[PDB]
Amino acid sequence: MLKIIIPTTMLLPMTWMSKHNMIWINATVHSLLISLISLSLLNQLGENSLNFSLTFFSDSLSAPLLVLTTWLLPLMLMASQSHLSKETTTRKKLYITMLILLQLFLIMTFTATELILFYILFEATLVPTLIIITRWGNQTERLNAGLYFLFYTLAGSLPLLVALVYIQNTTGSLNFLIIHYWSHPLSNSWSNIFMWLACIMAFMVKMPLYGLHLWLPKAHVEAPIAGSMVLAAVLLKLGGYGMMRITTILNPLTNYMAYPFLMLSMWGMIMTSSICLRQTDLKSLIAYSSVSHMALVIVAIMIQTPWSFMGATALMIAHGLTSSMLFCLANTNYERVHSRTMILARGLQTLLPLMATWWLVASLTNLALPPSINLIGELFIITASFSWSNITIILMGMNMMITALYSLYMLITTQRGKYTHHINNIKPSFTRENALMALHILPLLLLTLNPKMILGPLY
Amino acid sequence: IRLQEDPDPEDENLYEKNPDSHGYDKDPIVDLWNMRVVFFFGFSIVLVLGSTFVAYLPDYRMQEWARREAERLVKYREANGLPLMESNCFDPNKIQLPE
Amino acid sequence: PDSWDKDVYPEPPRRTPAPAPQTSLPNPVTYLTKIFDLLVDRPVTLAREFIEQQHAKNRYYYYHREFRRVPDITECEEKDILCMFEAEMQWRRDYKVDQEIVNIIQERLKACQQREGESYRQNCAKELEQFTQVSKAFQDRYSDLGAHYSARKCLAKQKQRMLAERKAAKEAAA
Amino acid sequence: NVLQIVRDHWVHILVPVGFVFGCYLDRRSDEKLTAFRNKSLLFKRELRPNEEVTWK
Amino acid sequence: MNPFASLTLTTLTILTIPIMMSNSNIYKTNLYPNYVKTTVSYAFTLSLVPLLMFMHTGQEMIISNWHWMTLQTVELSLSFKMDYFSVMFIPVALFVTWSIMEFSMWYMHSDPFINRFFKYLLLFLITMMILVTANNLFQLFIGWEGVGIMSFLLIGWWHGRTDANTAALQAILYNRIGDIGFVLSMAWFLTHSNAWDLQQIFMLNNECPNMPLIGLLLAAAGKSAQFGLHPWLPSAMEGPTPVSALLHSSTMVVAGVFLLIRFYPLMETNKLVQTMTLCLGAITTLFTALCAITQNDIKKIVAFSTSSQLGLMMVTIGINQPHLAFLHICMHAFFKAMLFMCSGSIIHSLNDEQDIRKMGGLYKAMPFTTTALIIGSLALTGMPYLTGFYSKDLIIEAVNMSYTNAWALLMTLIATSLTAAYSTRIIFFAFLGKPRFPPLVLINENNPLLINSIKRLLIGSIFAGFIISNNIPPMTVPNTTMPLYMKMTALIVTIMGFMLALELNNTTYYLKFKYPSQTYKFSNMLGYYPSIMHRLPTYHNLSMSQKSASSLLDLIWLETILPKTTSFIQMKMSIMVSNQKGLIKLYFLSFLITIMISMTLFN
Numbered sequence A: 001m002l003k004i005i006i007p008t009t010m011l012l013p014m015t016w017m018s019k020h021n022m023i024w025i026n027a028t029v030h031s032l033l034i035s036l037i038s039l040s041l042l043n044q045l046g047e048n049s050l051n052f053s054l055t056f057f058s059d060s061l062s063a064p065l066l067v068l069t070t071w072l073l074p075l076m077l078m079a080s081q082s083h084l085s086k087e088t089t090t091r092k093k094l095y096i097t098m099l100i101l102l103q104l105f106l107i108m109t110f111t112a113t114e115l116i117l118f119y120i121l122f123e124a125t126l127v128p129t130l131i132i133i134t135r136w137g138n139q140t141e142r143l144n145a146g147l148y149f150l151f152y153t154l155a156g157s158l159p160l161l162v163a164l165v166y167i168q169n170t171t172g173s174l175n176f177l178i179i180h181y182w183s184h185p186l187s188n189s190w191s192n193i194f195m196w197l198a199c200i201m202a203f204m205v206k207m208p209l210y211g212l213h214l215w216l217p218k219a220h221v222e223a224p225i226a227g228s229m230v231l232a233a234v235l236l237k238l239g240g241y242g243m244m245r246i247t248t249i250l251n252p253l254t255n256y257m258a259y260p261f262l263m264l265s266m267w268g269m270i271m272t273s274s275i276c277l278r279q280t281d282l283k284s285l286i287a288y289s290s291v292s293h294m295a296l297v298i299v300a301i302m303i304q305t306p307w308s309f310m311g312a313t314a315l316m317i318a319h320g321l322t323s324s325m326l327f328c329l330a331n332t333n334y335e336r337v338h339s340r341t342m343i344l345a346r347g348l349q350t351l352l353p354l355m356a357t358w359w360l361v362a363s364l365t366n367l368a369l370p371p372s373i374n375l376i377g378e379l380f381i382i383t384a385s386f387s388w389s390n391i392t393i394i395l396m397g398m399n400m401m402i403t404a405l406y407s408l409y410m411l412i413t414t415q416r417g418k419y420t421h422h423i424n425n426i427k428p429s430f431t432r433e434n435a436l437m438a439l440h441i442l443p444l445l446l447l448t449l450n451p452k453m454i455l456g457p458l459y
Numbered sequence B: 001i002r003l004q005e006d007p008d009p010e011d012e013n014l015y016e017k018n019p020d021s022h023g024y025d026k027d028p029i030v031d032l033w034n035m036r037v038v039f040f041f042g043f044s045i046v047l048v049l050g051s052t053f054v055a056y057l058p059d060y061r062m063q064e065w066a067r068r069e070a071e072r073l074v075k076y077r078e079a080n081g082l083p084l085m086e087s088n089c090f091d092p093n094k095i096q097l098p099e
Numbered sequence C: 001p002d003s004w005d006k007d008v009y010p011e012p013p014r015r016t017p018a019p020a021p022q023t024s025l026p027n028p029v030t031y032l033t034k035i036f037d038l039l040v041d042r043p044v045t046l047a048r049e050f051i052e053q054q055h056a057k058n059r060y061y062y063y064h065r066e067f068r069r070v071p072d073i074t075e076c077e078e079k080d081i082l083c084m085f086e087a088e089m090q091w092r093r094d095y096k097v098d099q100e101i102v103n104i105i106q107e108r109l110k111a112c113q114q115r116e117g118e119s120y121r122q123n124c125a126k127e128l129e130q131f132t133q134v135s136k137a138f139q140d141r142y143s144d145l146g147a148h149y150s151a152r153k154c155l156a157k158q159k160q161r162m163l164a165e166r167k168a169a170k171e172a173a174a
Numbered sequence D: 001n002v003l004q005i006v007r008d009h010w011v012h013i014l015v016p017v018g019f020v021f022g023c024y025l026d027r028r029s030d031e032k033l034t035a036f037r038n039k040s041l042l043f044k045r046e047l048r049p050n051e052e053v054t055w056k
Numbered sequence E: 001m002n003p004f005a006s007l008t009l010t011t012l013t014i015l016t017i018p019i020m021m022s023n024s025n026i027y028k029t030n031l032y033p034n035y036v037k038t039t040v041s042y043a044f045t046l047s048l049v050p051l052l053m054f055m056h057t058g059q060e061m062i063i064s065n066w067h068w069m070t071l072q073t074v075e076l077s078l079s080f081k082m083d084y085f086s087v088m089f090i091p092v093a094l095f096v097t098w099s100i101m102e103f104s105m106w107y108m109h110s111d112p113f114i115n116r117f118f119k120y121l122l123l124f125l126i127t128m129m130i131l132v133t134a135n136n137l138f139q140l141f142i143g144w145e146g147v148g149i150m151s152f153l154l155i156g157w158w159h160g161r162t163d164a165n166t167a168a169l170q171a172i173l174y175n176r177i178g179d180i181g182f183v184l185s186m187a188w189f190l191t192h193s194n195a196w197d198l199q200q201i202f203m204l205n206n207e208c209p210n211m212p213l214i215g216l217l218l219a220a221a222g223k224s225a226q227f228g229l230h231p232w233l234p235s236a237m238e239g240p241t242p243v244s245a246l247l248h249s250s251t252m253v254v255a256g257v258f259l260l261i262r263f264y265p266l267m268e269t270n271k272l273v274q275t276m277t278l279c280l281g282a283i284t285t286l287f288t289a290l291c292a293i294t295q296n297d298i299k300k301i302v303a304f305s306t307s308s309q310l311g312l313m314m315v316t317i318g319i320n321q322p323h324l325a326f327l328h329i330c331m332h333a334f335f336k337a338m339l340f341m342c343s344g345s346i347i348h349s350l351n352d353e354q355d356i357r358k359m360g361g362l363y364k365a366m367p368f369t370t371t372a373l374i375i376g377s378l379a380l381t382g383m384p385y386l387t388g389f390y391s392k393d394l395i396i397e398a399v400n401m402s403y404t405n406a407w408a409l410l411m412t413l414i415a416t417s418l419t420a421a422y423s424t425r426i427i428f429f430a431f432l433g434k435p436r437f438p439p440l441v442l443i444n445e446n447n448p449l450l451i452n453s454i455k456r457l458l459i460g461s462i463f464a465g466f467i468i469s470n471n472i473p474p475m476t477v478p479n480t481t482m483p484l485y486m487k488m489t490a491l492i493v494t495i496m497g498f499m500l501a502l503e504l505n506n507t508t509y510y511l512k513f514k515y516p517s518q519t520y521k522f523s524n525m526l527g528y529y530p531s532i533m534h535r536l537p538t539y540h541n542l543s544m545s546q547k548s549a550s551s552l553l554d555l556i557w558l559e560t561i562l563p564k565t566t567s568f569i570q571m572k573m574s575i576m577v578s579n580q581k582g583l584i585k586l587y588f589l590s591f592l593i594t595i596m597i598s599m600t601l602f603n
């Protein structure tokens, strides 16, 4: 994994030694090169994972997330160069450095072979994100959003650290291969119940679980465009990856401790879709859509079947791409009119045609339209939940109906209708914005063409 | 008033000075070359080359190998009357049950 | 064709009836088939002949990988990590092979149903029985192992099944 | 001139040399894990007359 | 190789071809509509060829050309089932689409985005072909959602029209409830049959159960606008007339009926689901005809007629006559497409006037559209030897001669009478009498595009039924023996409806004014179903979305429990700890207390 880690640690000096007018060009070009290099990890084995060394390893679950991170970095660079034109050169370099550090920590997190190193890195992802939010956010609420995000995540994660050190003391190793080959059943006792609670609650807060999600609207709405893109695409997937990795040793206690979390996830998925139906803010609408999708992923992981894990992985990748695209579209419209109210700007279908096409495609992918990988993952999760029980179909159907309703409501409100009469600063869409949308959408359709690359180890 | 504060500047339009602007930078040459490098590298290199690389990735998942092995096993078992799918993954002779 | 084994993928001998016309009218299907042969089949055949002739000049081979048997989880000692890893890998490969066996039987069932058409209920009883046996065995072997399945878990399930069978047999003989 | 261009475009080699160094370090890490090379029960075989190791 | 598979896949591919040319100067110019129409005509002939192949030897095939992915023991591959249903429906759909596209070349001349309109029509055709030829459930669902989203895009064609946007979203909502049912069926089939394809589903499901069959029934009702989920189809008239003629009435609303037909072995195995399908179809056809007989919008009348015919087809499926349902699908496609085209011609001639109260005198004002509409109405009502006779008459005879629900049979007969009634209403208020349109007469129906499209769909409305009936092999045992009065039941009720509706419409000439009745108010206002069911449930759901989920739970109580209470406790304790006056006497007395406590308590 050093052939991918070291190029980022070289991107840092490149950013800090480039000329003032070439920082964005250099960062984008070399981020795309690093993504191309990281595409090699998709060649996975059918029996075991790719164990590079004693510290880093790659799996059919880690590879798509790493590729998504490496592909997402240049898009964040494009959006940031859009909205940071008046900043000084030093602050531009600092912003690029924060993005690079976040990507490096995410790569090391997804490739870490030991639970304690994984914990250290996935906690280290907070600092660049908090700095980005609380420093380059636009509104007054960025400080409160950062506080909420940081303290929710840390209150979740500290008992996870205690549980990890206790597991190390009890068993002798936190290496994932060792804890998988030497896994032993977890007897039904209060101590095991609380260990299960510590681990699962940390990752549920990271997911986020319904009832533990307020930090997500707070942070996503108030963060800059790059922060919003990375929060939804990758940082939300740390919880799912951790739960997939950590549930090896939690059986058979997961068969009994999953009921409250399953009920919370299903009913909160319904509730957050309904909230999306009546949202006066576009970023809030997208954030609650993210909450619903991650609640579905939580349901899949908790029911814990080979068919659910594949759907969970596919839904994670598809939701990451779709949420990044939706946040980018909302940011473009915000840069037009300097306000996040959804009904302020209308008639954008007749004011900006190709951007309306991008909106339509993003909304179509947001709802499960076949044969998109969104639909593939959602359908796999729905079928696994149907096998689990036969009223999960009722809940999933209600969620799908409300999902289509709010997606098309957002599309119609933002695009259809008649344009606002007094808004006359909506310039034609930039080549940069259109290229950003194209780079968001085309990989989604290519992954639809080749679906087995994002179905996880269980395929 | 309570401060000596600058008024909020008017929003700047890139099309005002550069009518054919891609939206990357104020300087026309740097803007054009940023657009060129982004489009070339991203679309051409990443999309086309990575997509064809993924399409032609070698069969390391052993899907074709597993199909061939299954074909051979089915041929052997059906040609000799043995069941196509064994009832046990392991050998009861090698499994020692407690009494 | 020689591409696939006719025994692995069975197919009944085709019985096409001989045409016995009873009208002096021409056959539009026959005329259109002749036109299709003259306009499409011959050009594609010539193109494929040229392509195959090009292929035969640079002929090269690829092989089928062979794996030798290794001791399984039953033979592996407790907390012997190397033997445990070898047995787990072998069990995973055998699991994939069994999945492909089930897939082959299912494909045979589907093809026989479509072939028999209107009388599939009676004529496909042979293929339905084979699929029933294969599915029953596969389900008994890998039914509810879970997302984190392993050779140890499958062995424990087999031990539980064997204990239940032994108890039932002892009760019957009692 | 070349001296002015190189003074501005010398940073573009950093990521490529980092990639090369990372590949080299991957090779070095792999060369330290040759404890069961040509000794696994599944892949154990006799060496060819003109080769020293099965993999590097 | 047999030309069957090659020709079928070629028709599908050449349908797809003009979409690949949508980024070219031909798409930029004004030759794109004619280009798409020519491609559709070529596809129609190339699909007629395999129909000739089937009519001779009855050849049917499945083509699993490309393997998509293997999910353990479940293999999903791109498979097309070219059977009797596919090889008979494809030429009919392509013929109808060809006629609709020429009629749209005439009708949509002034539209700024006629090229995009033709691209959307072609995309809908492609998705419908995928749905029809799909061999496995995943591909069938792909076609399902494709035609749904194309309907959404084409209903709200005029994006500035709020009513158009509402109609599009309403159609999406009802089809999404249908998709809930479809996903239930797909999940059950996978779980209990280890496959998503028709071959293994039919093999393993020797006696199909209520859960999958009810899932399929719900999906079909949603897609075909049966009772309970009906209002979206009449409201879908907000789109342009070509969209209503091609998409909804003729080809897309028969998707649910086609889905039920494709699982006719399972439907034969079950009985309760057959009874439910029969009752749903009966109530749907009766209710929709009753609503139709008193509408003043010609597009609305034709839409309700389409819904009634769909209900009749669902009745046909419910009595275990799946092939009659498909025959009626074809015949109805023909004559309903022609009727919608004639209505669109009338609307265009009278300057976007869709009110029969303003139409009149068109019998002599427009000869060709008049005769075409009369022929279509006669075929719809079951003229003794037209296209609708070879399906509707057999359907009625099967309903009478089977072990059916008495109420369902009675409602079917009443629906036939009301069909005659609303056809009489259309003719009487659109062509007979004196003109009521504005004085500036812009009537001109001499366009070759319109004339040729109506001619092509007019020869089918007369002769296609005979040809199709005489060429298909016998798919069921005929009802040779029956009482004479029961043989004449369809004709008798048709004539009775004609006469009663004609008398009631002639009573309008009298200089006598009377207030409307309760039954008239119920029938005209669509049974009050759109009002209550579109105002009460939506209001309650949206109110709960903000009052309870957003405000009460998300913004108030979930904030009060974890983040606010903890912060308040920390603030209170911090104030308590730091609220010290810095008095050495006080905290040294505290030190003394601490020392005594340590000495005594700790041992």
Ligand SMILES: CCCCCCCCCCCCCCCCCC(=O)OC[C@H](COP(=O)([O-])OCC(O)COP(=O)([O-])OC[C@@H](COC(=O)CCCCCCCCCCCCCCCCC)OC(=O)CCCCCCCCCCCCCCCCC)OC(=O)CCCCCCCCCCCCCCCCC
Pocket: E290, E293, E294, E410, E413, E414, E417, E418, E421, E425, E493, E496, E497, E500, E501, E504, E505, E508, E514, E515, E516, E517, E518, E519, E520, E523, E524
């Ligand atoms: C909870 C109840 C649940 C019921 C479930 C079952 C429902 C079944 C319904 C069946 C259809 C009923 C009739 C149509 C109702 C709507 C009428 C309407 O809106 O007309 C305006 C509408 C025209 O409106 P417009 O031109 O816009 O002008 C506004 C009007 O001027 C405005 O003038 P208007 O407001 O004075 O006109 C309406 C008025 C006058 O219009 C009519 O009477 C039209 C129907 C006349 C024919 C139906 C009766 C006779 C049918 C059989 C005749 C032959 C029998 C056999 C004889 C030989 C036996 C060997 O209608 C009535 O007074 C009610 C008559 C229908 C009663 C339906 C059953 C009871 C409903 C609930 C109880 C309350 C009823 C009283 C009304 C409310 C309280 C005041 O009329 C038409 O378009 C024609 C309607 C009739 C044509 C079809 C006639 C034949 C088909 C139906 C009968 C079945 C024949 C085959 C039987 C086969 C058996 C095996």
Ligand SMILES: CCCCCCCCCCCCCCCCCC(=O)OC[C@H](COP(=O)([O-])OCC[N+](C)(C)C)OC(=O)CCCCCCCCCCCCCCCCC
Pocket: B036, B037, B040, B045
């Ligand atoms: C057996 C042989 C099989 C095939 C082997 C092929 C081997 C090719 C070896 C040579 C490659 C290098 C030379 C060509 C590079 C591309 C230039 C080009 O097409 O420009 C035209 C295009 C279009 O040119 P244009 O639009 O500027 O000019 C049009 C013409 N006039 C002047 C009239 C306007 O160039 C661009 O768009 C410029 C964008 C920036 C390019 C920066 C290139 C940097 C150097 C190359 C780096 C490549 C890294 C690839 C990733 C890592 C490896 C996978």
Ligand SMILES: CCCCCCCCCCCCCCCCC[C@@H](O)O[C@H](CO[C@H](O)CCCCCCCCCCCCCCC)COP(=O)(O)OCC[N+](C)(C)C
Pocket: A039, A064, A067, A068, A071, A317, A443, A446, A447, A449, A450, B046, B047, B050, B051, B052, B054, B055, B056, E019, E020, E021, E022, E023
């Ligand atoms: C303007 C008009 C638009 C429409 C018309 C456009 C022009 C016509 C295009 C028509 C395309 C219709 C679909 C037909 C596709 C044909 C090619 C396709 O079938 O090939 C697939 C090829 O699939 C590819 O693998 C898909 C590439 C997936 C790329 C993923 C993203 C690439 C990196 C991007 C970075 C972003 C990362 C995102 C998170 C991971 C099938 O895979 P496979 O059958 O096996 O290949 C056979 C070769 N083998 C046998 C050796 C294997």
Ligand SMILES: CCCCCCCC/C=C/CCCCCCCC(=O)OC[C@H](COP(=O)(O)OCCN)OC(=O)CCCCCCC/C=C/CCCCCCCC
Pocket: A277, A397, A398, A401, A405, E163, E166, E167, E169, E170, E173, E177, E180, E217, E218, E221, E226, E227, E228, E229, E235, E530, E531, E533, E534, E537, E538, E541, E542
């Ligand atoms: C299984 C899941 C539950 C299924 C039923 C749940 C129904 C939930 C209702 C959805 C809540 C609506 C959220 C927002 C939707 C968009 C807002 C809205 O109301 O749209 C307005 C729009 C405008 O009305 P118009 O008549 O066109 O008048 C226009 C005048 N200018 O109205 C609508 O589109 C709403 C239509 C759906 C409302 C609910 C009706 C569904 C109830 C029927 C369920 C019973 C089905 C029975 C099955 C029978 C087959 C076996």
